[PDB]
Amino acid sequence: APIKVGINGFGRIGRMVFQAICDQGLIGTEIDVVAVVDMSTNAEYFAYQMKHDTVHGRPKYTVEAVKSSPSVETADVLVVNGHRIKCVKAQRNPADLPWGKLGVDYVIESTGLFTDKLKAEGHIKGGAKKVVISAPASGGAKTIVMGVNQHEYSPASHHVVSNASCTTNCLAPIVHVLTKENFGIETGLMTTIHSYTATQKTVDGVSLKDWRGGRAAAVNIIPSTTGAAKAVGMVIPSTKGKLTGMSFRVPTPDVSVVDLTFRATRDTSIQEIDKAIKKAAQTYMKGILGFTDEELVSADFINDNRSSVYDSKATLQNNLPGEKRFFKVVSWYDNEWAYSHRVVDLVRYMAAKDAASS
Amino acid sequence: APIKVGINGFGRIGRMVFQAICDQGLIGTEIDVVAVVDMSTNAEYFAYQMKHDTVHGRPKYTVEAVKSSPSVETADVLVVNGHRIKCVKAQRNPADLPWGKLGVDYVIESTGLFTDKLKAEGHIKGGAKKVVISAPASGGAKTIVMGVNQHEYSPASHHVVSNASCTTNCLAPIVHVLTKENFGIETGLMTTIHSYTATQKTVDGVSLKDWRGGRAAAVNIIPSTTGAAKAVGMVIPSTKGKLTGMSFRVPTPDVSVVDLTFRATRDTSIQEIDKAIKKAAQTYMKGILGFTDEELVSADFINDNRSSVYDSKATLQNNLPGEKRFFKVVSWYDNEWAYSHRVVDLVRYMAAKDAASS
Amino acid sequence: APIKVGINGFGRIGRMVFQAICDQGLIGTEIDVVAVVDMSTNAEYFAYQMKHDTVHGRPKYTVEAVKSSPSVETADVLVVNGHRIKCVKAQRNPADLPWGKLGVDYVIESTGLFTDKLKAEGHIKGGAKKVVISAPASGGAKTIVMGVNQHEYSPASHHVVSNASCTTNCLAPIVHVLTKENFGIETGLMTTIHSYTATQKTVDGVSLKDWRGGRAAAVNIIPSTTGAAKAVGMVIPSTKGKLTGMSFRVPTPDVSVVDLTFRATRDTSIQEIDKAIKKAAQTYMKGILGFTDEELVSADFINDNRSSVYDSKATLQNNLPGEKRFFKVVSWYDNEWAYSHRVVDLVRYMAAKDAASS
Amino acid sequence: APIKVGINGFGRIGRMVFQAICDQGLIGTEIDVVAVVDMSTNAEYFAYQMKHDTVHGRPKYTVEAVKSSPSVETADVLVVNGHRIKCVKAQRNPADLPWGKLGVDYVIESTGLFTDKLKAEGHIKGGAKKVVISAPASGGAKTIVMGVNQHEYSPASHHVVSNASCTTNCLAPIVHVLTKENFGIETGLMTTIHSYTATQKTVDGVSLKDWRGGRAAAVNIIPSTTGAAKAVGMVIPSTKGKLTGMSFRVPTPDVSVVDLTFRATRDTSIQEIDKAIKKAAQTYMKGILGFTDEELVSADFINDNRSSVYDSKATLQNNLPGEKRFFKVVSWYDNEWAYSHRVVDLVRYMAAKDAASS
Ligand SMILES: COc1cc(OC)cc(C(=O)N[C@@H]2[C@H](O)[C@@H](CO)O[C@H]2n2cnc3c(N[C@@H]4CCCc5ccccc54)ncnc32)c1
Ligand SMILES: COc1cc(OC)cc(C(=O)N[C@@H]2[C@H](O)[C@@H](CO)O[C@H]2n2cnc3c(N[C@@H]4CCCc5ccccc54)ncnc32)c1
Ligand SMILES: COc1cc(OC)cc(C(=O)N[C@@H]2[C@H](O)[C@@H](CO)O[C@H]2n2cnc3c(N[C@@H]4CCCc5ccccc54)ncnc32)c1
Ligand SMILES: COc1cc(OC)cc(C(=O)N[C@@H]2[C@H](O)[C@@H](CO)O[C@H]2n2cnc3c(N[C@@H]4CCCc5ccccc54)ncnc32)c1
């Protein structure tokens, strides 16, 4: 019973999620990407945008652009591994989307302009059944971080779900094992060295909301705020008002690291922490949280689909020798690749549970 | 008789030109910047954008934002070295600009949205007397490159002048001397290694017009076309259909180089050419054309206001030892800085000429 | 009869070549890498360096480090897909190497310290049969370019061969067809936009031989000289004194592009040339010279083992509309990857022929 | 009574220090740089190196190379603002240096090969009176951080002094006011986002000591260790065993930032801390410690000679709303520029104090 999904906003995130679907070989069999919606319907451009990626390389599948009617001037259909995907024209209000007429049940909202529970619900008024916002949402939409609180998802109450942010999906797992393994977390501050994103500018440009963020991205270290910290609070209730962090945008196309600094509740050691994370990574967090014993650098995580991959050497080596409460944990993440796979995971999960509960 | 000027579009180019004026110490005395126009009138932001620049550093003048009336919520006035500059609200049609009302004669069109002779004339219909487009223009506007064909300016026939492109202001001078010194130029192809611009994307983004140009700028070598070559033909009649070139946008915030390859009309030597360029650079091209005997690198030309600075060493060392016709000439240019100083020069020239002829 | 090869110098070049072998699935079966030589024998480190590459990624094979005798403190043997590779200690003079005792017939010289025919012969006096220099050589060593003049290899006369430079292996193919297809080549100047290399400095450093080359590599456009052009003369005699070029080091970790400008012997067209290259790329040049009609960028050629991949769109779009003699041809190349495969190819070629002539 | 100083090792560090002398306009008048010592005495190359700096641009003084005698083949004397500086040939053992014969009293040890108290003392045996090492030193060499503990310099007891590291000169200040203002500091962990340095590599190279540090610097986020934390322990004894930190080398040629996360001894607020730092910056720390209310990015600190410049906004905006103990303070520093100025300051201080005590 192919999950009928539709992508709204075929940009970095959008394509990444689609590529995530194809990559896992779900296209056609498990998931049915009925269509993608964007300011353009030029299937040839998307084809080009999917066949070539500066950071992730070439896709393992074949992509081709075709016309729906020999009548049309430019291709408006995308064919991936045989499957046909319609390139729908973008709309102002989601409610004006032919989701219903297309048979789309799950809508992947990745335009970044409908991060509000209310506005996002327009997709349901357009014929959709469920909406996954590929970013942090407001308006009180249920936020889920695969591997930490998917079970809290209710097919009957939650219709607009948020997968949180790429950053949150790296911290939450760590924090989860930290609290689950009773290490406790009195308070904690986290710093994130992040790769520049699409919202940044190549040369000092305009940015009325984030002045610093409007400066030459590839040649500056740009500080910035991040709700990723507080956000972990919605996913892990016991951490509300206990966390907060900041971000440092630095000259790299992709892959970011997280430097979590926290104070435990009871005496403990960095080795105890180190072993727990690894243990958890080999058990209830396997697939979501991983680790490494090697001397790696950002590029070594490109295309790593774990939400958070703990740096053992970095952590063990940079903590006070005999400290018992004040600690620093380091974990990496491929902000683009990993988050993409999680989006898909959430959809499949939602789909399954939505079907089971009938 | 302060030149009443206005700036339409206060972005990279816009400010750059305004900073050039102040930098030259013309603000207030020689040139009077009555006001600037943009999608925002937040003088504070503008002050910020001017007091801080990733590539050029801190300005030599002081900048402060003030309120026209203590009644306004956010500053709307700029104050450079005493001179007050009004921050006007942008309009859809240049004609709807209070140029006459403000007493602005010369308008610097740097929005990039009115590069067409016709649309640009709107400023005049708006009360403006003259217009200098800070970019290549169409609609049959007089294109002028200081130090090459300014004399061809007619105070009564040319009302919308174009200062050409940053690149053309580099190749033009070289070609000019190459022709004037009777070296002759049968045909010629020019490659340009260019720093990425504001139109490029930090990460693989959208770009329907220039597909490659949409790819991550700071981490790729991106080929593109350039009218800079053919354009020299408008500035130097004898080169029509003789020149053409391409570009390669590379990972640098600013500073570009030109690799001109041509064939002479009569047997000569690279040594001859070398000496001619240098001679011209110390004479009729001084201020516009410069040269260097040092082993410089892109960075070394940052803030160099010459339109084009010939690379003697690079040139002498990379040509065929005994060649007499096929040659390669190399020259750098601070694509941002220099171009800006030329626009001002162009405005001061037209001004001085427009006045002289009464 | 597995070819007995040895690698002297295990740096970027060294490893790359080895990896090229493994990558081609020749390790153990076709080619037998008896041992590698370098200032260090820490197999663990080598393993690390092979398993993680910032530019090429993770290898398709398994690499592990082991000890020759449980007696040694640190691993001194590499195990690739089962095959055992010895980590010999480096020597001052190549003749002091146990090439004979080791059973090494073909020695890949990639230290860069023995680029001279004489010094290189040291290896043979050390027991080696043939020597292939992974760089341009002097002393009068036969220089070969796979796909252009390998047929000029004399098993009985050539005991020290040079696979030329990465840049040459890109130009030669193009120049080769251009001449074979009788387009003729009166003269020509080529410009190469090259990615920075290991010899360059991260920040302004010391470089008494190449002043420019000593400037911050990832933040500048650095000109330099290059025999790559004149060198094509040694592979293609008919072009001696006709070719020459320069280089521009730019902010990228890998992949370079060649911009060849030349004048033909007879009247022709850019289309003729475009078709001739593609045709050759699909026939006698397949494997060595490829092409592409896509809007690619540097990143798109990573791990492209073709010596030279002609850019059709770039070429066709940036030449004079009706030109008949002055043309520009653009071609990309993975200076690291491709060159590495050719070195391997050359060794196998020589091996096959050296074996055939008994 | 111009201070007689000599520079041993004229590289990045070497030159920066010298340039810092000239920049402050002390050359000839206040400080007499008698000569510099390096593996090369090519004044022309040093002249070049000082006249062109990628990150710091052109100098505010003139630099020319001359010959000690018309007989010498290549210049060996440096002339800055009329002052003559001798270029002496390097030696294995500092003690073989003609310091005494040249009349040098204060030697700035910046080769990076004599960071050990014992080895460095050779300079004195060579005729020198005092030695200032421009890096962290071992062997029990007094370490001073201008603005924090210069008063602990003993003319009669300390002959070999260390100016610590660029990073310590940024952390010490903050920590100093944090303790002096009685905010206390139970424990603290500092993370530093650092620009790549000269010890790093352009492309994946060799680094037996620091494996990750051997990876492509300009295209990776590379974690490393740093004694900068523990080092502040020697400068401010009250913090022994309380601090520690790690580093993140990122893709930038200069300018680093420190992220200090500490726990106060008594309840307070980030606003309290904020005000204290700002206050101290306008009083007893002026010149050493600075702050900023602006939305600045790394590039804005280029050529800022303050040891550490506190980021108010970044701080006030990224802490827990009502926290009273767990805090995060952010501060920048031009790792090259600043440190250089401090080295000079220390020398002057030592000189003044040495003189005073007769
Ligand atoms: C791929 O081709 C192009 C071409 C283009 O301009 C020519 C823009 C983009 C681009 O920005 N593309 C955006 C980018 O890829 C991503 C957001 O980061 O989503 C895309 N996007 C932007 N706006 C929308 C939208 N509705 C808007 C809501 C706001 C008002 C409005 C009014 C009329 C029509 C649509 C809309 N619906 C779906 N995807 C969107 C892409
Ligand atoms: C400084 O703060 C901001 C804020 C902002 O959005 C919130 C956009 C910009 C920005 O893009 N700023 C642009 C940028 O700096 C530069 C082009 O590269 O010109 C700026 N620019 C863009 N459009 C205009 C304009 N009129 C437009 C022409 C057609 C449409 C239209 C409709 C109603 C009213 C005006 C206009 N007039 C002057 N400068 C402009 C700057
Ligand atoms: C991988 O581990 C390390 C560790 C190291 O220092 C600790 C250096 C290197 C390194 O530079 N490694 C070099 C690098 O990987 C590559 C060149 O790009 O070749 C390596 N290399 C440099 N010199 C030699 C050499 N002989 C030299 C010729 C000159 C005189 C001399 C005297 C005594 C002993 C050896 C030699 N033989 C083999 N490989 C070499 C590698
Ligand atoms: C500027 O031109 C050049 C040219 C050159 O080689 C041709 C090397 C350098 C260079 O490395 N330059 C180094 C670089 O600029 C800086 C370190 O960051 O210090 C330089 N440097 C390296 N070694 C020394 C030294 N003594 C060494 C100690 C080690 C053994 C030894 C043996 C005989 C004679 C001297 C020495 N004394 C002073 N500066 C040094 C610079």
Output the six-digit token pair for B117.
């002779």
Compute how many other C-beta atoms are within 10 angstroms of the C-beta atom of residue B8.
31
Which ligand 3 atom sits closest to the C-alpha of C112?
17
Task: Return the residue in A202, A296, A297, A300 with the most chain C beta carbons within 10 A, the one to mutate for interface testing.
Answer: A300
Tell me, in angstroms, the distance from the centre of ligand 4 to residue D129's CA: 23
CA-CA distance, D190 to A259, in Å (whole number)? 10
CA-CA distance, A168 to A227, in Å (whole number)? 8
Distance from CA of B294 to the nearest CA of D (A): 8
Answer yes or no: do B11 and A205 touch at CB < 8 A: yes
Do residues C153 and C349 make contact, with C-beta atoms less than 8 angstroms apart? yes
Do residues D262 and D187 make contact, with C-beta atoms less than 8 angstroms apart? yes
**Which of these, B49, B318, B12, B56, lies nearest to B166 by C-alpha position?**
B12
The one-letter amino acid code at A311 reads D
Identify which of A48, A54, A296 has the shortest CB distance to residue C295: A48
β-strand partners of C247: C192, C224
- Would you mind telling me the total number of residues written for chain B in this entry? 358
| Chains in contact with D, counting 3 or more C-beta pairs less than 8 Å apart as contact | A, B, C
Output the six-digit token pair for D174.
């903050």
What residues have CB less than 8 Å from D252, skipping those under 6 apart? A219, A220, A221, A250, A251, D195, D196, D298
Using alpha carbons, list the distances in angstroms from residue D153 to B121, B231, B274, D119, D350.
72, 67, 59, 20, 7
- Fold that domain A165-335 belongs to in CATH: Dihydrodipicolinate Reductase; domain 2 (3.30.360)
Query: Which of A:264-303 have CB within 8 Å of D?
Result: 295-299
**DSSP letters spanning A239-292:** GTTTEEEEEEEES-SS-EEEEEEEE-SS---HHHHHHHHHHHHTTTTTTTEEEE
Residue ranges, CATH 3.40.50.720, chain C: 2-164+336-355
Cβ of D38 less than 6 Å from ligand 4: yes
β-strand partners of B309: B290, B332
Distance from CA of B204 to the nearest CA of A (A): 7
Identify which of D52, D294, D302 has the shortest CB distance to residue B57: D302
Which run of H or of E encompasses A84? Answer: strand A83-89
β-strand pairing of B3-8 with B31-38: parallel
Distance from CA of B320 to the nearest CA of C (A): 6
Cβ of D91 less than 6 Å from ligand 4: yes
DSSP 8-state class, residue B299: G
The set of catalytic residues of C is 166
Maximum Cα interatomic distance, chain D, rounded to a whole number of Å: 74
Query: Does D205 reach chain C within 8 Å, measured CB to CB?
Result: yes
Provide, as residue numbers in chain C, all residues whose Cβ is less than 8 Å from the Cβ of D253: 202-203, 216, 218-219
Distance from CA of A173 to the nearest CA of C (A): 26
Do residues D136 and D154 make contact, with C-beta atoms less than 8 angstroms apart? no
* Ligand 3 pocket mutation, candidates C8, C38, C91, C116, criterion most atoms within 8 A of CB: C38
| Chains in contact with A, counting 3 or more C-beta pairs less than 8 Å apart as contact | B, C, D
Half-sphere exposure of C207 (CA within 13 A, CB side): 21
Q: Which residues of A305-338 are buried (b: 16+ CB within 10 A; e: fewer)?
A: bbbbbbbbbbbeebbbeebebbbbbbbbbbbbbb
Which run of H or of E encompasses C172? Answer: helix C168-180
**Which of these, A49, A66, A65, A44, lies nearest to A10 by C-alpha position?**
A49
Do residues D315 and D330 make contact, with C-beta atoms less than 8 angstroms apart? yes
**Radius of gyration over every alpha carbon of chain A, rounded to an integer in angstroms:** 21
**Which of these, C306, C347, C311, C344, lies nearest to C329 by C-alpha position?**
C311
Three-point CA angle B173, B175, B176, nearest 5°: 60
Do residues A168 and A288 make contact, with C-beta atoms less than 8 angstroms apart? no
Terminal C-alpha separation, chain A: 13
Query: Does D358 reach chain B within 8 Å, measured CB to CB?
Result: no
State the alpha helices, DSSP H only, in chain B.
12-23, 43-51, 99-102, 117-120, 122-125, 168-180, 228-235, 270-282, 312-317, 337-356
CA-CA distance, D91 to A99, in Å (whole number)? 79
Do residues C145 and C167 make contact, with C-beta atoms less than 8 angstroms apart? no
* Ligand 2 pocket mutation, candidates B7, B17, B36, B39, criterion most atoms within 8 A of CB: B39
Output the six-digit token pair for A220.
């500056």
Q: In what order do the strands lie in the sheet with A326-333?
A: A222-226, A243-250, A187-195, A256-263, A326-333, A308-311, A289-292
DSSP 8-state class, residue C191: E
What phi and psi values does residue A168 have, to the nearest 5 degrees?
Answer: -55, -35
Do residues C48 and C58 make contact, with C-beta atoms less than 8 angstroms apart? no
**DSSP letters spanning D110-169:** -SSS--BHHHHTHHHHTT-SEEEESS--BSS-EE--TTTSGGG--TTT-SEEE---TTHH
State the alpha helices, DSSP H only, in chain D.
12-23, 43-51, 99-102, 117-120, 122-125, 168-180, 228-235, 270-282, 312-316, 337-356
How determined?
Answer: X-ray
Terminal C-alpha separation, chain C: 13
Tell me, in angstroms, the distance from the centre of ligand 3 to residue D50's CA: 32
Compute how many other C-beta atoms are within 10 angstroms of the C-beta atom of residue C272.
15
**Which of these, B247, B268, B253, B252, lies nearest to B319 by C-alpha position?**
B268
For B250, the 3-state DSSP assignment is strand
Which run of H or of E encompasses B1? Answer: none
Do residues C326 and C269 make contact, with C-beta atoms less than 8 angstroms apart? no
Do residues C315 and C345 make contact, with C-beta atoms less than 8 angstroms apart? no
Using alpha carbons, list the distances in angstroms from residue A177 to A144, A147, A165.
16, 11, 19
**DSSP letters spanning C93-149:** SGGGS-HHHHT--EEEE-SSS--BHHHHHHHHHTT-SEEEESS--BTTPEE--TTTS
CA-CA distance, B276 to B182, in Å (whole number)? 10
Identify which of D48, D211, D251 has the shortest CB distance to residue C211: D48
Tell me, in angstroms, the distance from the centre of ligand 3 to residue C87's CA: 13
Task: Determine whether the annotation assigns residue D7 to a binding site.
Answer: no
Answer yes or no: do A48 and C299 touch at CB < 8 A: no
**DSSP letters spanning B147-174:** TTSSTT--TTT-SEEE---TTHHHHHHH
CA-CA distance, B184 to D323, in Å (whole number)? 76
Q: After which residues is chain D broken (C to N over 2.5 A)?
A: none
Asked about B166 being catalytic, the answer comes back as: yes
DSSP 8-state class, residue C182: T
Half-sphere exposure of B197 (CA within 13 A, CB side): 18
Identify which of D193, D212, D326 has the shortest CB distance to residue A187: D326
Output the six-digit token pair for B201.
């994307």
| Chains in contact with C, counting 3 or more C-beta pairs less than 8 Å apart as contact | A, B, D
Cβ of D110 less than 6 Å from ligand 4: no
What residues have CB less than 8 Å from D25, skipping those under 6 apart? none
CA-CA distance, B162 to B148, in Å (whole number)? 14
Residue of chain A nearest C298, judged by CA positions: A54
**CATH of the domain spanning B2-164+336-355:** 3.40.50.720
Answer yes or no: do C202 and D204 touch at CB < 8 A: no
Terminal C-alpha separation, chain B: 13
Compute how many other C-beta atoms are within 10 angstroms of the C-beta atom of residue A175.
30
Tell me, in angstroms, the distance from the centre of ligand 3 to residue C92's CA: 9
Output the six-digit token pair for C38.
């370098």
Query: Does D216 reach chain B within 8 Å, measured CB to CB?
Result: no
> Mind spelling out the 3-state secondary structure of B38-51?
ECCCCHHHHHHHHH
Maximum Cα interatomic distance, chain A, rounded to a whole number of Å: 74
CA-CA distance, B328 to C259, in Å (whole number)? 13
Distance from CA of C52 to the nearest CA of A (A): 7
Using alpha carbons, list the distances in angstroms from residue A294 to A276, C52, D208.
18, 10, 15
Query: Does D217 reach chain C within 8 Å, measured CB to CB?
Result: yes
What residues have CB less than 8 Å from A330, skipping those under 6 apart? A257, A258, A259, A260, A310, A311, A314, A315, A318, D223, D246
**Which of these, A61, A8, A68, lies nearest to A36 by C-alpha position?**
A8
Compute how many other C-beta atoms are within 10 angstroms of the C-beta atom of residue C30.
15
**Which of these, B57, B56, B60, lies nearest to B23 by C-alpha position?**
B60
Task: Determine whether the annotation assigns residue B166 to a binding site.
Answer: yes
Identify which of D52, D296, D303 has the shortest CB distance to residue B300: D52
Answer yes or no: do D218 and C219 touch at CB < 8 A: yes
